[PDB]
Design a protein around this ligand. Structure first.
Ligand SMILES: [Mg+2]
Ligand SMILES: [Mg+2]
Ligand SMILES: [Mg+2]
Ligand SMILES: [Mg+2]
Ligand SMILES: [Mg+2]
Ligand SMILES: [Mg+2]
Ligand SMILES: [Mg+2]
Ligand SMILES: [Mg+2]
Ligand SMILES: [Mg+2]
Lengths: 66, 188, 116, 151
RNA sequence: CGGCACGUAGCGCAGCCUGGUAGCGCACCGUCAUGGGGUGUCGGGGGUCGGAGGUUCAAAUCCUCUCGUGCCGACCA
RNA sequence: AUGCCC
RNA sequence: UAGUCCGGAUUGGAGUCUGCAACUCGACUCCAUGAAGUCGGAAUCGCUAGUAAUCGUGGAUCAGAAUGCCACGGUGAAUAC
């Protein structure tokens, strides 16, 4: 680590909409207003609404039948 | 400071004989039987651009000259001097009125013109093939009774005059080819 | 000023701003602002962060860019793989809803290609 | 036209001030037969100009016209191989009419926000001998004084 | 035989010296003008350098060897 | 001023 | 004053109706999508007054299927030396 050459690196608290605050060192300077983090991102409960297969025959015999 | 022999120079080389620069356009070497071989060279007097023909005896010729031609971007003519700047040497290379022979009319600005300078002084200017100029004085294109081709003379921003079809009025930039001196487009 | 993964401009009103999403037109944005209780004459600047999170919940109730382009392309490809008439039309880049092609297909055929 | 010269129609003056030439002006501005919107635009511009100029809108309008109104103009003839530019006087109704036309064309070209503001700027600059309108007047006088040798 | 000077768009030529963009005329294509053709006007497209191998960061250009062509004289006994 | 032919 | 709260083309999904039957190939609606286009080259057209320009409405044909055609009014110019 040289002395003058790097930007300021200070501790910043980041607040999410999951309601949790992420205290972390960073270079943004100010605080942080975060919207979506890891523990709230729909990556565990989204792998079905994200894949959206469906079935044509089911939709059909729903719309009408014999 | 290099001296060239007649049976040495093929086309392209620049010579300095008689204190006038020349440039070999073509040269056929003849070696007859039972005679002293020689060469019929077609020279280009690099000062007036007029061809002269010489037959040079195998024995001797002359030294080369400082005839170099490269693109120099026209800058401005102030008074009688046409300045340039090498793109890469950025030199205030200057010519003069004789050096610019009736190419002035084809010269506007920011024009990269290949020039030939002899011993650090440009003796000639070659205007680029096409040049965008703007008409400044032209009567309207009133068709009237024409049943044929016709045309229209048009004074340009450099003094140059050229025939333009009918529709170009004033404020139109017309592409004209410096070689012939004739209209090519309306530059849209 | 950040919703469903895309950045939304700040100087414009909320409805137009929300339309800046892929999957939200003007009526959809009107519905969003209604359900969230946020007015329409308000610009994105000067909103509570909380208000913005409410908007996020509503648009999540809808469907937007990622899943939308996924299902669009999936349907298109289902067509192009069946090889039904609409499929072949998609494949060849011609109008599908039955327009004329003797002229005026410039949108599906791009610019015109002269003979060579 | 060719057969028989014919009289000009009558125009009813404007409501606000009741001036025939101002009513002509709205007309020139008018497009699509939207006389009402044209009236609104010209009235708003006149208000703005009166406020910028002090004296009433009538003398404001009229000094703008006194500046843009030409007196000689040129019409081509194509005599022989070359076409000509004959400088001919302009009769008063014509100079008024095309002065208004040049003004409104300048305005339409101008790059302000609303047409009332464009027209206001144009009338102001014309009153103070500026703008594309008086530029056109100058060009026309200049073409005539160039081709003066013809008559 | 060598020296030599070429080989570039359908055809005629530039560019090459002094490597980093292949251009210029005719032709060619689509309108327009015309009763129709032509002249004319307005738009556009076209090869990437005879072939091979090396120098280089990079070759139509610099090298070298080929191939197709031109001109040259190949003499004194 | 230009204007050829069916 | 943005390719925009302009423009609506194209396309996905979901429907209505007429009609034995809307795949080739109807119109229409809702959601989403948001091309080209920033006034148009040479060249060319219409118009002299309730005209041009602009805005809507009706009819024939017809089950459905018009930006066309035939009609109707609303506003309403410039210019002709
Ligand atoms: Mg919609
Ligand atoms: Mg159809
Ligand atoms: Mg001035
Ligand atoms: Mg002007
Ligand atoms: Mg013949
Ligand atoms: Mg565009
Ligand atoms: Mg604009
Ligand atoms: Mg009539
Ligand atoms: Mg109508």
């Amino acid at each position: 680590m040289k002395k003058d050459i790097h930007p300021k690196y200070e501790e910043i608290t980041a607040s999410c909409s999951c309601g949790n605050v992420m205290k972390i060192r960073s270079t943004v300077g100010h605080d942080l207003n975060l919207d979506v983090c890891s523990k709230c991102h729909p990556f565990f409960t989204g792998k079905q609404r994200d894949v959206a297969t469906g079935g044509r025959v089911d939709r059909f015999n729903k719309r009408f039948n014999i | 400071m290099a001296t060239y022999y007649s049976n040495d120079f093929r086309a392209g080389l620049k010579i300095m004989l008689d204190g006038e620069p020349y440039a070999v356009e073509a040269s056929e070497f003849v070696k007859p039987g039972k005679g002293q071989a020689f060469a019929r060279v077609k020279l280009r007097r690099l000062l007036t651009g007029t061809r002269v023909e010489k037959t040079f005896k195998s024995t001797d010729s002359a030294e080369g000259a400082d005839v170099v031609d490269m693109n120099l971007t026209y800058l401005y003519n102030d008074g009688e001097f046409w300045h340039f700047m090498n793109n890469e040497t950025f030199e205030q290379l200057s010519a003069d009125a004789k050096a610019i022979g009736d190419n002035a009319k084809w010269l506007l600005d920011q024009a990269e013109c290949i020039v030939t300078l002899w011993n650090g002084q440009p003796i000639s200017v070659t205007p680029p093939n096409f040049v965008e100029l703007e008409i400044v004085d032209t009567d309207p294109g009133l068709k009237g009774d024409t049943a044929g081709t016709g045309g229209k003379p048009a004074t340009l921003s450099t003094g140059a005059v050229v025939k333009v079809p009918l529709f170009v009025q004033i404020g139109e930039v017309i592409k004209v080819d410096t070689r012939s001196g004739e209209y090519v487009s309306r530059v849209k | 000023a950040r919703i469903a993964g895309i950045n939304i401009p700040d100087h414009k009103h909320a409805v137009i701003a929300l339309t800046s999403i892929y999957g939200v037109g003007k009526t959809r944005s009107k519905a969003i602002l209604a359900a969230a209780g946020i007015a329409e004459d308000v610009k994105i600047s000067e909103l509570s962060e909380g208000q913005i999170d409410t908007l996020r919940d509503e648009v999540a109730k809808f469907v937007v860019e990622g899943d939308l382009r996924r299902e669009i392309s999936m349907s298109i490809k289902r067509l192009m793989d069946l090889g039904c008439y609409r499929g072949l039309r998609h494949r060849r880049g011609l109008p599908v809803r039955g327009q004329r092609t003797k002229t005026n297909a410039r949108t599906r055929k791009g610019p015109r290609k002269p003979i060579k | 036209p060719r057969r028989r010269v014919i009289g000009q129609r009558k125009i009813l003056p404007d409501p606000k001030f009741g001036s025939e030439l101002l009513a002509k002006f709205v007309n020139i501005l008018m497009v699509d037969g939207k006389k009402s919107t044209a009236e609104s635009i010209v009235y708003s511009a006149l208000e703005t100009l009166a406020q910028r100029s002090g004296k009433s809108e009538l003398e404001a309008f009229e000094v703008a016209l006194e500046n843009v109104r030409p007196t000689v103009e040129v019409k081509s003839r194509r005599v022989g191989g070359s076409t000509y530019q004959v400088p001919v006087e302009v009769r008063p109704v014509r100079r008024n009419a095309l002065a208004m036309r040049w003004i409104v064309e300048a305005a339409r070209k101008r790059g302000d926000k609303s047409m009332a503001l464009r027209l206001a700027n144009e009338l102001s600059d014309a009153a103070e001998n500026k703008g594309t309108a008086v530029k056109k007047r100058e060009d026309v006088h200049r073409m005539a004084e160039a081709n003066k040798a013809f008559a």
